[PDB]
Amino acid sequence: SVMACGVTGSVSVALHPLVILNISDHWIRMRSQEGRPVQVIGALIGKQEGRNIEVMNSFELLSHTVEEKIIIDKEYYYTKEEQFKQVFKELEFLGWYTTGGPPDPSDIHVHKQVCEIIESPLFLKLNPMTKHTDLPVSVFESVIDIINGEATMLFAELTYTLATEEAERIGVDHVARMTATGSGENSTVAEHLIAQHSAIKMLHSRVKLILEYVKASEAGEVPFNHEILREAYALCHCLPVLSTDKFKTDFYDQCNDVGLMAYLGTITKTCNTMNQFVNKFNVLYDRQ
Amino acid sequence: SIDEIYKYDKKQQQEILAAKPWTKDHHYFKYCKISALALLKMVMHARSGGNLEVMGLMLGKVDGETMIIMDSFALPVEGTETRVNAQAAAYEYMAAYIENAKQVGRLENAIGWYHSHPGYGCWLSGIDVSTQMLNQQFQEPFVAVVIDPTRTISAGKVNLGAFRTYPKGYKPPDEGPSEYQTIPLNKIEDFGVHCKQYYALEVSYFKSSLDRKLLELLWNKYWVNTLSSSSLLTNADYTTGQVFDLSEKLEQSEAQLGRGSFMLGLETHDRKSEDKLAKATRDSCKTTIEAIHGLMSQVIKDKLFNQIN
Amino acid sequence: IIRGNQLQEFAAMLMPHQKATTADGSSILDRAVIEHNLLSASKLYNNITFEELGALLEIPAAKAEKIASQMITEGRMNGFIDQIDGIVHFETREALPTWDKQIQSLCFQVNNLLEKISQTAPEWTAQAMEAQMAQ
Amino acid sequence: IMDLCIECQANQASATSEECTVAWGVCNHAFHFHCISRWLKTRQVCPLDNREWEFQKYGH
Amino acid sequence: QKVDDDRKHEIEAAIVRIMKSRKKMQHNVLVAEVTQQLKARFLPSPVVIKKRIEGLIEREYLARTPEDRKVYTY
Amino acid sequence: TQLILEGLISARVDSHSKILYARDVDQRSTTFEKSLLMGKEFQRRAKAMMLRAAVLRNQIHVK
Amino acid sequence: KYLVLANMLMKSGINPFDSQEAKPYKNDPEILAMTNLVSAYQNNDITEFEKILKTNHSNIMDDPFIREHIEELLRNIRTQVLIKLIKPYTRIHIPFISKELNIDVADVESLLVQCILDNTIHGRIDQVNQLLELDHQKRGGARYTALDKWTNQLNSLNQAVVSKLA
Amino acid sequence: PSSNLLEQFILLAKGTSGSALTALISQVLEAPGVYVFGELLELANVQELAEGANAAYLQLLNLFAYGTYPDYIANKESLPELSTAQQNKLKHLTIVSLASRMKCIPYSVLLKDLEMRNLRELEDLIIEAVYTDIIQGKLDQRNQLLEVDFCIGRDIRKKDINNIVKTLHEWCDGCEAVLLGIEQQVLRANQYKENHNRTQQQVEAEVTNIKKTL
Ligand SMILES: [Zn+2]
Ligand SMILES: [Zn+2]
Numbered sequence A: 001s002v003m004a005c006g007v008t009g010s011v012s013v014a015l016h017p018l019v020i021l022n023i024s025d026h027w028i029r030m031r032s033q034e035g036r037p038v039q040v041i042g043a044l045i046g047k048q049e050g051r052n053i054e055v056m057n058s059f060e061l062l063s064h065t066v067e068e069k070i071i072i073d074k075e076y077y078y079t080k081e082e083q084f085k086q087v088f089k090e091l092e093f094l095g096w097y098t099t100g101g102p103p104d105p106s107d108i109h110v111h112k113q114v115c116e117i118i119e120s121p122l123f124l125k126l127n128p129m130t131k132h133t134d135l136p137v138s139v140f141e142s143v144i145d146i147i148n149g150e151a152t153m154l155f156a157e158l159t160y161t162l163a164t165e166e167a168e169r170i171g172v173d174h175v176a177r178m179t180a181t182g183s184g185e186n187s188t189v190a191e192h193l194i195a196q197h198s199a200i201k202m203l204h205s206r207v208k209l210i211l212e213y214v215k216a217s218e219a220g221e222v223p224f225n226h227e228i229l230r231e232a233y234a235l236c237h238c239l240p241v242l243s244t245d246k247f248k249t250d251f252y253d254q255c256n257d258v259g260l261m262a263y264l265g266t267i268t269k270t271c272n273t274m275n276q277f278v279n280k281f282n283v284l285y286d287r288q
Numbered sequence B: 001s002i003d004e005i006y007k008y009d010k011k012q013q014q015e016i017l018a019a020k021p022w023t024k025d026h027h028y029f030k031y032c033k034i035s036a037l038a039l040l041k042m043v044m045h046a047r048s049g050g051n052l053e054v055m056g057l058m059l060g061k062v063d064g065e066t067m068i069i070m071d072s073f074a075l076p077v078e079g080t081e082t083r084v085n086a087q088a089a090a091y092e093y094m095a096a097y098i099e100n101a102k103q104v105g106r107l108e109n110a111i112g113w114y115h116s117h118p119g120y121g122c123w124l125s126g127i128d129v130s131t132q133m134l135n136q137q138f139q140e141p142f143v144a145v146v147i148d149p150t151r152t153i154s155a156g157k158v159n160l161g162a163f164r165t166y167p168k169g170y171k172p173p174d175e176g177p178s179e180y181q182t183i184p185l186n187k188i189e190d191f192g193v194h195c196k197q198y199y200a201l202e203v204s205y206f207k208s209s210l211d212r213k214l215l216e217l218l219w220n221k222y223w224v225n226t227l228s229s230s231s232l233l234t235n236a237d238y239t240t241g242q243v244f245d246l247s248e249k250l251e252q253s254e255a256q257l258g259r260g261s262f263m264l265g266l267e268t269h270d271r272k273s274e275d276k277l278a279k280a281t282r283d284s285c286k287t288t289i290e291a292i293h294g295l296m297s298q299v300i301k302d303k304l305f306n307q308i309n
Numbered sequence C: 001i002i003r004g005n006q007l008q009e010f011a012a013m014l015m016p017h018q019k020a021t022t023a024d025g026s027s028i029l030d031r032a033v034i035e036h037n038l039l040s041a042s043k044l045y046n047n048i049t050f051e052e053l054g055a056l057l058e059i060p061a062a063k064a065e066k067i068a069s070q071m072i073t074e075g076r077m078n079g080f081i082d083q084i085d086g087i088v089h090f091e092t093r094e095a096l097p098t099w100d101k102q103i104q105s106l107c108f109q110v111n112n113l114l115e116k117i118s119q120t121a122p123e124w125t126a127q128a129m130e131a132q133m134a135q
Numbered sequence D: 001i002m003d004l005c006i007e008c009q010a011n012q013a014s015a016t017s018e019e020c021t022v023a024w025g026v027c028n029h030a031f032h033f034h035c036i037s038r039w040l041k042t043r044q045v046c047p048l049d050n051r052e053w054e055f056q057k058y059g060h
Numbered sequence E: 001q002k003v004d005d006d007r008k009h010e011i012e013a014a015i016v017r018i019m020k021s022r023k024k025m026q027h028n029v030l031v032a033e034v035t036q037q038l039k040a041r042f043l044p045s046p047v048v049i050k051k052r053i054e055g056l057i058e059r060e061y062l063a064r065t066p067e068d069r070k071v072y073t074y
Numbered sequence F: 001t002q003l004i005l006e007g008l009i010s011a012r013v014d015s016h017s018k019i020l021y022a023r024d025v026d027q028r029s030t031t032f033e034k035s036l037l038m039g040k041e042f043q044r045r046a047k048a049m050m051l052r053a054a055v056l057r058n059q060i061h062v063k
Numbered sequence G: 001k002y003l004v005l006a007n008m009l010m011k012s013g014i015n016p017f018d019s020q021e022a023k024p025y026k027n028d029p030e031i032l033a034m035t036n037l038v039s040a041y042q043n044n045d046i047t048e049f050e051k052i053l054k055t056n057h058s059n060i061m062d063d064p065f066i067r068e069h070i071e072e073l074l075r076n077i078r079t080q081v082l083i084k085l086i087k088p089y090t091r092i093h094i095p096f097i098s099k100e101l102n103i104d105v106a107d108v109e110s111l112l113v114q115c116i117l118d119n120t121i122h123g124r125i126d127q128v129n130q131l132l133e134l135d136h137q138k139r140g141g142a143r144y145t146a147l148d149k150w151t152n153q154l155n156s157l158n159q160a161v162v163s164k165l166a
Numbered sequence H: 001p002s003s004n005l006l007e008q009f010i011l012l013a014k015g016t017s018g019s020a021l022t023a024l025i026s027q028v029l030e031a032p033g034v035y036v037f038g039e040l041l042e043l044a045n046v047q048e049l050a051e052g053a054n055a056a057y058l059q060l061l062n063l064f065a066y067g068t069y070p071d072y073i074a075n076k077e078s079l080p081e082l083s084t085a086q087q088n089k090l091k092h093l094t095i096v097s098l099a100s101r102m103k104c105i106p107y108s109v110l111l112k113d114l115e116m117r118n119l120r121e122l123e124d125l126i127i128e129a130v131y132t133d134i135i136q137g138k139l140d141q142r143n144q145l146l147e148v149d150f151c152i153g154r155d156i157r158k159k160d161i162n163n164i165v166k167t168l169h170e171w172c173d174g175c176e177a178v179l180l181g182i183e184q185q186v187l188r189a190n191q192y193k194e195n196h197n198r199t200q201q202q203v204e205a206e207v208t209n210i211k212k213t214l
């Protein structure tokens, strides 16, 4: 077993969408080049402030399989290290990433070589063949444990977060707006209401968890979890919200405005269809 | 097949580069398809900049009348927007970057250059035009991409343009819709001038697995409050501009039709008028679907939250 | 909100009087106290009448309307005044911003509650995992 | 003479080392660079004399 | 040397004032107007004015909108 | 009253107290009213055109 | 003295006394009296300005040329004080402005009418109740007008095209 | 520091009790900061006070936990006389209960439920409650309204657990109904797309048939 049991995260890891973007692109191209989903290996860079680690960017590494062992071209990694120096100074190496499922007895070999380079590398593994609705990205750290009298390096899962800036947020929001359309338009409202469906599902799952906790407290658990059940009941008392004449008036105002806009759009489509029909009819029987 | 575009066919690219069909037509390249990765990287770099122009190189390929951008990378250069062919200062760097990229399986070569216009739209100035002209003198298939990171944020819609220059002495044909941009006083003067000067490439893009990963992750959490109001279209600048352009286009169509009623036997005029009317109708329609989807999301969510029980 | 008993300690510290060489502009203390009391008024009060505002500031309503007028002119306090009714409309976030902020605060409080149950009660996290695996 | 102008107010908020200095004319008068810039667009006659207000210095 | 330096900034004072919002200078087009304006003055100095329009780095602090030809200038 | 009938005064006459009150109509209400009128006229013209197409396709004309 | 009055008349917002006048031509006794006038002009102290005019009338409007321009100068400064003051408090009673300006109510009404007709005031006057109602223009519209114009113009366009093609 | 002071008194209540506990509870009602009294009520020594001879302080504490100011006015004979701090704290709690139901509170309701005569002191009490981070909101004086955006919650007598369960069940049922409606919209949109594709393929088949005919 390469996974440590009972070991909690010692540092906080912040991940950016660009890192996941690099991993996905690396896996796709290698799959396209060599058929099956060939495992990819790259490196992680970013800023580290004490125990707070922020992974802002990531890049690829050259590796070779010799004696059924993955040998990372650290010389290429070092050649690429000064290459990224020429563009960015504030970004420092933080760890390496790969693709696959559970850790295999080859990633430990990769990690020990990366641990040789720097003081403390971070290990990230992405699962491109996942089927659940959760993020198939996990961050692991290096821990030394005495197993059967021998010091064996293990991986401890880290409770990383997803940190992003206003820029990236707006950018990917409009990337989703652009995916809402396309050359091969299958459906648009389908994707829209599927997105709302996923959001409502997340909220419903939260409500189910709260209700289950309340029922358990009624049965066992803590009879009163203090501020938690207090705030839960208060929020359930704010569920009605209560609108005023002005809010309903403004809601109906916006609805009427955009409905009039929709009516105008339907009129435009209908008049275009009428123009096409008239153009065809003027050729069907009419002259001049 | 969603991932078919990611397949690189080197011999096919060599065949296209030997054929040079763009020499037969200065309007040959009409479409620009951009991957998610490239666009995201570019936007991020430009916003880190903040109010200063940055630039980089785009890696990709060609496919018929379509230019395809697969990836991009920043260039460590000074004088973007002031120096003609500023990219030249990064020549050595570009050679090494690409060499190292080829070592890790990046097979696509240089397809263009991108740079930012923070808060002044997306167009080609006299300098940009000189640079892209030189970039289309030695590397004819080159696309210039311009991004406004500031207007992207303020408008809530990606502000990007793809452009190609005309050779010295060559005049554009009759068509040129030219969407108006709110560039500053003298910047807009020069903008009208260079919109008359170059030609834009229809933004096409492609939904892929890169896009699938992004849309899914950001919507889950950055949109825990999937609210974000619901109408970033409330700003009467984009929809209003589209409405005004629609009105101008249909007014010009009517003006053409009125004069065309006296000439008996002009089929081309009828064809052009019908096509213009159809294009205007589709533009208005797509605006209508956008508004309707916005209102639908708004209605469902606000009804649920305000009056669930 | 600043009342009239904090004046004594601050005034003594300033310059055994007021920090400069005296203030005499109704004291720079009270000028800032009134100015802050208008900011604190701007945070809550959607609108305010002349008499009620003046009693809050411990000044005549004629003084209250003038300083509020001055702050609006300088842009340090948003709003408008109506002299007929004698009421100053400080701030109202229409209907959409208020609703959006309320929804965002509700979602943030829900997330805080979920995090608190997960942290303070890991047994709840185990029970939730068991329940989601059962169903 | 220093300490910013009416068009700039505070020191920070996108100043980049405060790109607003004092400008000197041939008539030896001194004002802010931005203040005369707004003056020079409408009129051009150096409101303290009747010299044409050449540009002889930047900063103090 | 002083009068030669006087020539070198007077052309730049004139160039950023005239090609500000006149016609179009894609390459060496509107520059002929400035040479005609300074024809009765001194030599057109083509090479000098051609490297000095790009050499508008008079602000070392800069860190703001760069000197894009005459757009940044008044 | 003559000026209001001709226009360019945009006012209403209150003959009770003899006070001339200016008219400031809501843009949105007039816009919605005339948009509904335009839609009704468009539907009527569409019906007219469909009837014209029906009578032309079936060759209906007075001999 | 003529130049200082001329600088006032052009509604200039720059101290003419600053440096060329320096002190010999900024603190000369009668010139210093003129310095107080432009100082009140900068501060828009209408009450103080009129007090100095009446105090030094033997050297203020003594010149027949200046005496002609005192009425216009008073009109301008009263307008500037009015324009500066009226920014807040829409729907103000007229007599309050008259007391603040220390002038008659009829003069305030005439000045208000001139300011509105110059497009400097976004509002109208209620002469029945002695009231000045200012348009707050908080609707934030002017786009529905463009939408309606576009709708009507292009729908008439479509109707004309259909009629001509049929 | 109210929570730390609350916990210290909880630890002290585990030991010393009686008249000292009642005086300690009175100090809690007088010391500003404490806005939640549910944790105190669940101490075993509070239950010891239930069977104890003294009940005025317990009925006092019980009212602060569940009752409001008008109930306290009704019980001015069975409750120990409060201080100025105790009265203000109860008035803040009553405002919390009022703000919990309605997010907009007219000044008429404020003057009625709280025995408020002078409107000036009403504003002073409102701002005092807000500045101690009790209620977040906005005051409308032209309409004489109190718009409260956010407020702290209150305690439960374990009989509202059924109401909480019912509310959560209603929320779950509404969410499930919206999910089912969204799925029905999926089906309807897919059916419309299929109908459009059927029309397109019918047109293509008709065109191909005519091409074969000629
Ligand atoms: Zn550019
Ligand atoms: Zn400045």
Ligand SMILES: [Zn+2]
Pocket: D025, D027, D028, D029, D030, D046, D047, D048, D049, D053
């Ligand atoms: Zn000067």
